[PDB]
Design an enzyme around this catalytic site. Structure first.
Site, PDB file in Angstrom:
ATOM      1  N   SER A 119       3.247   2.169   2.992  1.00  0.00           N
ATOM      2  CA  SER A 119       3.576   0.950   3.748  1.00  0.00           C
ATOM      3  C   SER A 119       5.056   0.866   4.141  1.00  0.00           C
ATOM      4  O   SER A 119       5.396   0.179   5.117  1.00  0.00           O
ATOM      5  CB  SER A 119       3.176  -0.309   2.970  1.00  0.00           C
ATOM      6  OG  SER A 119       3.831  -0.373   1.718  1.00  0.00           O
ATOM      7  N   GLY A 120       5.944   1.517   3.387  1.00  0.00           N
ATOM      8  CA  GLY A 120       7.361   1.629   3.694  1.00  0.00           C
ATOM      9  C   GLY A 120       8.285   1.129   2.586  1.00  0.00           C
ATOM     10  O   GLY A 120       9.464   0.867   2.843  1.00  0.00           O
TER      11      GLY A 120
ATOM     12  N   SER B 238       2.317  -1.458  -7.387  1.00  0.00           N
ATOM     13  CA  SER B 238       2.052  -2.623  -8.232  1.00  0.00           C
ATOM     14  C   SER B 238       0.856  -3.426  -7.691  1.00  0.00           C
ATOM     15  O   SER B 238       0.997  -4.585  -7.311  1.00  0.00           O
ATOM     16  CB  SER B 238       3.287  -3.508  -8.378  1.00  0.00           C
ATOM     17  OG  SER B 238       3.996  -3.665  -7.154  1.00  0.00           O
TER      18      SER B 238
ATOM     19  N   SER C 264       9.559   2.654  -0.225  1.00  0.00           N
ATOM     20  CA  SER C 264      10.642   3.565  -0.579  1.00  0.00           C
ATOM     21  C   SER C 264      11.623   3.725   0.568  1.00  0.00           C
ATOM     22  O   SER C 264      12.831   3.842   0.338  1.00  0.00           O
ATOM     23  CB  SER C 264      10.074   4.922  -0.977  1.00  0.00           C
ATOM     24  OG  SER C 264      11.115   5.876  -1.131  1.00  0.00           O
TER      25      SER C 264
ATOM     26  N   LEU D 144       0.828  -1.190   0.000  1.00  0.00           N
ATOM     27  CA  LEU D 144       0.000   0.000   0.000  1.00  0.00           C
ATOM     28  C   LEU D 144       0.866   1.244   0.000  1.00  0.00           C
ATOM     29  O   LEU D 144       2.033   1.228   0.424  1.00  0.00           O
ATOM     30  CB  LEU D 144      -0.920   0.014   1.222  1.00  0.00           C
ATOM     31  CG  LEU D 144      -1.986  -1.090   1.289  1.00  0.00           C
ATOM     32  CD1 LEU D 144      -2.734  -1.007   2.591  1.00  0.00           C
ATOM     33  CD2 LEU D 144      -2.972  -0.963   0.132  1.00  0.00           C
TER      34      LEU D 144
HETATM   35  N1  LIG Z   1       8.904  -0.113  10.038  1.00  0.00           N
HETATM   36  C1  LIG Z   1       8.833   0.760   9.017  1.00  0.00           C
HETATM   37  N2  LIG Z   1       9.239   0.478   7.760  1.00  0.00           N
HETATM   38  C2  LIG Z   1       9.141   1.404   6.787  1.00  0.00           C
HETATM   39  N3  LIG Z   1       8.638   2.640   6.972  1.00  0.00           N
HETATM   40  C3  LIG Z   1       8.211   3.040   8.197  1.00  0.00           C
HETATM   41  C4  LIG Z   1       8.288   2.088   9.300  1.00  0.00           C
HETATM   42  N4  LIG Z   1       7.814   2.688  10.398  1.00  0.00           N
HETATM   43  C5  LIG Z   1       7.442   3.932  10.038  1.00  0.00           C
HETATM   44  N5  LIG Z   1       7.678   4.141   8.733  1.00  0.00           N
HETATM   45  C6  LIG Z   1       7.359   5.418   8.074  1.00  0.00           C
HETATM   46  O1  LIG Z   1       6.291   5.187   7.149  1.00  0.00           O
HETATM   47  C7  LIG Z   1       6.484   6.009   6.009  1.00  0.00           C
HETATM   48  C8  LIG Z   1       6.665   5.072   4.815  1.00  0.00           C
HETATM   49  O2  LIG Z   1       6.763   5.904   3.670  1.00  0.00           O
HETATM   50  P1  LIG Z   1       7.227   5.368   2.233  1.00  0.00           P
HETATM   51  O3  LIG Z   1       8.483   4.639   2.431  1.00  0.00           O
HETATM   52  O4  LIG Z   1       7.161   6.550   1.312  1.00  0.00           O
HETATM   53  O5  LIG Z   1       6.073   4.292   1.824  1.00  0.00           O
HETATM   54  P2  LIG Z   1       5.745   3.888   0.296  1.00  0.00           P
HETATM   55  O6  LIG Z   1       7.042   3.909  -0.470  1.00  0.00           O
HETATM   56  O7  LIG Z   1       5.206   2.473   0.460  1.00  0.00           O
HETATM   57  O8  LIG Z   1       4.685   4.882  -0.149  1.00  0.00           O
HETATM   58  C9  LIG Z   1       7.751   6.817   6.263  1.00  0.00           C
HETATM   59  O9  LIG Z   1       7.410   8.042   6.918  1.00  0.00           O
HETATM   60  C10 LIG Z   1       8.509   5.973   7.260  1.00  0.00           C
HETATM   61  O10 LIG Z   1       9.402   6.756   8.062  1.00  0.00           O
END
Ligand SMILES: Nc1ncnc2c1ncn2[C@@H]1O[C@H](COP(=O)(O)OP(=O)(O)O)[C@@H](O)[C@H]1O
Ligand SMILES: Nc1ncnc2c1ncn2[C@@H]1O[C@H](COP(=O)(O)OP(=O)(O)O)[C@@H](O)[C@H]1O
Lengths: 197, 199
Positions: free
Chosen positions: B35-36, B105, B38, B32
């Protein structure tokens, strides 16, 4: 023992950690001039020097990424555009990208170059004129392509080839052998800081 | 005096991997928005680079406004977006690079087409699908760009369009339970456990 700063690695960080700088070595020239023969030999040479190098040519582009493209004028432009972007991505990864397409039009090659030279951090774009006379490539003709002339809009015979006016490297493959062409390109890379000593 | 050697034709895959001390693969992140992906992709890339390994992140920052700038947001554009990303990630894996993709995706069929590009390749290339799995509640709490709050934005994955979760991926990481460093540790350990990077 896992360490990282927030955000993406910078280009200088990546280059330093991998001991190598990325660039695009853009081969252009008539069919049978020797682009493919030189590219695969150069790629092996650089790999023996423990360098990431990767060849882009018809074999790995035409029926994969660009399989949707035809042979109309607009398709041909888009083909080179996409190869330019992919070659930039390989350079950004600290890889020496070697493209081996006829790329006959000055404008198409110029747009590939500008993607590199206008990139936020400029990326070297090294245009290599693989220059062989029409008499030489017609005598070579390793695929019979020149004899068919049953084939339409063929670069150098029934379509134009736009020679680069003053490229970074100019190699006459009727006077230099394959190893000498690889030596010329590699020496240029070394003398310009793009590969280690 | 020169020092050049090469055989006729192209380097074979095994030759390239051996000379570079590394095998190429695609680590395909899916999940989603927020979700983390990037955040994990940039940390993982840095970690692998610290191990002197070629790794390269493919995401919106270097794909959307370059190679794929011609594509819009209709369903056909969306399918073509993932298709091309599958091809480019394969090229990077063929170059003995760990290719890390960070796109939502959302559709199973698109991820499957990317997978088959690798698994049906003349020499098979590992395709490592990583479910970056966070609950809708957590990503709405994160919403680092306000994308979930806009609801203003149409056909948004998880709110007004579907996310098709992987059934049984090679790696499944719950980012509400593991931190970023632990997510990098899991993926890196999987790579080593499968012989793709030196131990
Ligand atoms: N365990 C974790 N793993 C990855 N991101 C995290 C985690 N905990 C909190 N976050 C936060 O959630 C957000 C994830 O953003 P992002 O990486 O841009 O998600 P996506 O690429 O799926 O849209 C960031 O602010 C990151 O700091
Ligand atoms: N110095 C040279 N460099 C490259 N090719 C050469 C050279 N001398 C002779 N040749 C021959 O010319 C042909 C070039 O074919 P190829 O590499 O497929 O050209 P292109 O990719 O430009 O169409 C090959 O048969 C090669 O053996």
């Amino acid at each position: 023992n896992i360490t990282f700063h927030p955000g993406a690695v910078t280009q200088d960080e990546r280059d330093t950690l991998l001991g190598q700088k990325g660039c695009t070595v853009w081969l252009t020239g008539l069919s049978a001039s020797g682009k493919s023969t030189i590219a695969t030999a150069l790629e092996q040479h650089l790999l023996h020097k423990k360098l990431h190098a990767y060849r882009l040519d018809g074999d790995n582009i035409r029926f994969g990424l660009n399989k949707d493209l035809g042979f109309d004028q607009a398709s041909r432009v888009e083909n080179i555009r996409r190869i330019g972007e992919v070659s930039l991505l390989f350079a950004l990864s600290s890889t020496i990208s070697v493209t081996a397409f006829i790329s006959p039009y000055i404008s198409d090659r110029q747009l590939a170059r500008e993607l590199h030279e206008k990139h936020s951090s400029a990326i070297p774009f090294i245009e290599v004129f693989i220059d062989a006379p029409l008499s030489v490539v017609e005598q070579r003709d390793p695929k019979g392509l020149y004899k068919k002339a049953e084939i339409k809009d063929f670069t150098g015979i029934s379509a134009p080839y736009e020679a680069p006016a003053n490229p970074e490297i100019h190699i006459r493959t009727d006077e230099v052998d394959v190893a000498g062409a690889v030596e010329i390109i590699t020496k240029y890379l070394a003398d310009n800081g793009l590969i280690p000593a």
